[PDB]
Amino acid sequence: DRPIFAWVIAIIIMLAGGLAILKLPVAQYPTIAPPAVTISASYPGADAKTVQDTVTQVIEQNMNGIDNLMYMSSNSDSTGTVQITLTFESGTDADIAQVQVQNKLQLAMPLLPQEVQQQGVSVEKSSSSFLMVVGVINTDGTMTQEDISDYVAANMKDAISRTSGVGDVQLFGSQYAMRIWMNPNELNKFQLTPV
């Protein structure tokens, strides 16, 4: 056994191991999560009992033939929001478990009332915990909760949620809308209904 050859083998092991450090930034975990694919729908102004019978049940009834699955949990809230988290086996393709769930929804889509259809409906991958929160405050010509939340959405939010592998962004507020606040007496005065 000669030394110059062996002291070069260590140089290869030095470089090959050195090039593997270039996976930086290397994240903490090692994934544990049994893959979570969540379906979300929103009936605006509707109660908890109606959104269960008119949306929630229609979605669940239409969830058959999804390759792999552990269980499905549902919520149907008073606000009119419903979430169905189809949880899969640890190691199933989170990209294929995404589209097949979405394509079962494509068979329950036109059975949902026109009020909930125009109000979004979305299927995305989940983690149930936040990675990072970035607050936007004002320290000059002070804006407002309504003013900041709109700008944070119509200038920045859209660039994220589409960037480096984001599941879904929960914006702390709301973007601006043309809010029309009716008056019953002034409607009654000129014989007008909200219709």
Partner 1 sequence: FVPMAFFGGSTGAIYRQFSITIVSAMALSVLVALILTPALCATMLK
Partner 2 sequence: AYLFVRLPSSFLPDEDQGVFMTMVQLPAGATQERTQKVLNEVTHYYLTKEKNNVESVFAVNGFGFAGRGQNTGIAFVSLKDWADRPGEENKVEAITMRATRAFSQIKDAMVFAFNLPAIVELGTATGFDFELIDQAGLGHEKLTQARNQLLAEAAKHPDMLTSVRPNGLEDTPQFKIDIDQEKAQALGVSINDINTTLGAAWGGSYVNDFIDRGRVKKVYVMSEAKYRMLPDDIGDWYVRAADGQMVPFSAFSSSRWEYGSPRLERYNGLPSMEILGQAAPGKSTGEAMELMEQLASKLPTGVGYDWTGMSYQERLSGNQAPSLYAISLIVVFLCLAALYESWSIPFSVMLVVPLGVIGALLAATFRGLTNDVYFQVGLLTTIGLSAKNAILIVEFAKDLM
Partner 3 sequence: TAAAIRAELAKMEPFFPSGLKIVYPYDTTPFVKISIHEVVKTLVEAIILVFLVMYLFLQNFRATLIPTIAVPVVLLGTFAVLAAFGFSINTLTMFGMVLAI
Instruction: Give the footprint of partner 1 on this chain (CB under 8 A).
Output: 1-3, 6-7, 9-10, 13, 30-32, 34, 89-91
When asked if residue 171 is in the footprint of partner 2 (CB under 8 A), the reply is no
Listed in sequence order, the residues at least 6 apart from 122 whose beta carbon sits closer than 8 Å to its beta carbon are 39, 40, 168
Beta bridge partners of 40: 83, 122
- Minimum separation from the CB atom of position 192 to a copy of itself (A): 27
What is the per-residue binding string for partner 3 in 96-135, x denoting contact by CB under 8 A?
----------------------------------xxxxxx
Q: Considering only CA atoms, which of 58, 61, 64, 57 is closest in space to residue 100?
A: 64
Q: Which contiguous run of DSSP H or E holds residue 51?
A: helix 48-51
* CB closer to partner 3 out of 174 and 188: 174
The Cα–Cα gap between 62 and 144 comes to 43
Amino acid identity of residue 59, one-letter, is I
| Out of 50, 77, 85, 109, the residue judged to bind a copy of itself by CB under 8 A | 109
* CB closer to partner 1 out of 13 and 166: 13
Using CA atoms, how far residue 141 sits from 2, 148, 153, 157, 159, in Å, is 75, 12, 19, 22, 25
Q: Which residues of the chain form contacts with a copy of itself (CB under 8 A)?
A: 60-61, 63-69, 72, 93, 95-96, 98-100, 102-103, 105-107, 109-111, 117-118, 120-125, 158, 160-163, 165-169
